[PDB]
């Protein structure tokens, strides 16, 4: 509710609007989706690679992030990219058919698109439930962009050098979220909302750990790793 806190919220909202296209116009640039085992890999690999760029673009605008060292910025983005991707995907996720609907039937993704290969259901079943539970929080867009930023600036990520500064930046955002809920999220929706949002960050860590397991299996098959992008291999590697 402070002038500084409103400043943070305005920056994070504009940063999100600059890095998330609700028209999904750029999806034409991706390799084409095909729906028959790994038929969707080239299209979805380009989707993830595109989204990593947008997550980095959002991360740059977070107040205090640029004040970090270059190496802490890389550690934070490497460990959080897939978590922010899962978070930011909730905007396109719909509970009608439990799918990410990005504007066209070709750009609608369900469990069968992603969970037919290997053990990928061990990630997709918990991921859909996370999407369902996150949607049922009905967050304000202000709260959506704060949670993404809090997720990125995490002091406990492995390999963080300066950790006190990461904590100071995250607490600035965390105190902005808690004060926002009290001041503009009315009851009953705001009941326990901050604690439920923090719990979603814990769900993301287990989804992150499961994603790491499936990527390692996917990447060890060179024929499948050929289908990825250079940025995905660099970040998820």
């Amino acid at each position: 509710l402070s002038e500084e806190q409103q400043h943070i919220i305005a920056i994070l909202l504009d940063a999100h609007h600059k890095t998330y296209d609700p028209t999904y116009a750029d999806f034409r640039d991706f390799r084409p989706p095909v729906r028959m085992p790994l038929s969707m890999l080239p299209h979805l690999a380009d989707l993830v690679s595109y989204s990593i760029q947008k997550v980095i673009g959002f991360a740059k605008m977070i107040p205090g992030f640029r004040d970090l060292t270059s190496d802490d910025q890389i550690v934070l983005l490497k460990s959080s990219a897939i978590e922010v991707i899962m978070l930011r995907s909730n905007q396109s996720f719909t509970m009608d058919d439990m799918s990410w609907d990005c504007g066209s039937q070709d750009y609608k993704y369900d469990v069968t698109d992603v969970s037919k290969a290997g053990h990928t259901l061990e990630l997709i079943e918990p991921l859909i439930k996370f999407q369902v539970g996150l949607k049922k929080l009905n967050l304000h867009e202000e709260e959506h962009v704060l949670l993404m930023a809090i997720c990125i600036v995490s002091p406990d990520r492995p390999g963080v050098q300066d950790a006190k500064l990461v904590e100071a930046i995250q607490d600035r955002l965390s105190n902005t979220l808690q004060t926002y809920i009290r001041c503009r999220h009315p009851p009953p929706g705001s009941h326990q909302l901050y604690a439920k949002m923090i719990q979603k960050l814990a769900d993301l860590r287990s989804l992150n750990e499961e994603h790491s397991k499936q990527y390692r299996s996917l990447s060890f098959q060179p024929e499948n790793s050929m289908k990825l992008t250079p940025l995905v291999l660099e970040v998820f590697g």
């Binding site: 673009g57 740059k60 890389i74 983005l77 490497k78 660099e234 970040v235």
Partner: peptide, 9 residues
Amino acid sequence: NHPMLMNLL
């Protein structure tokens, strides 16, 4: 050793 990500930064 992360040229593309550091360039995006």
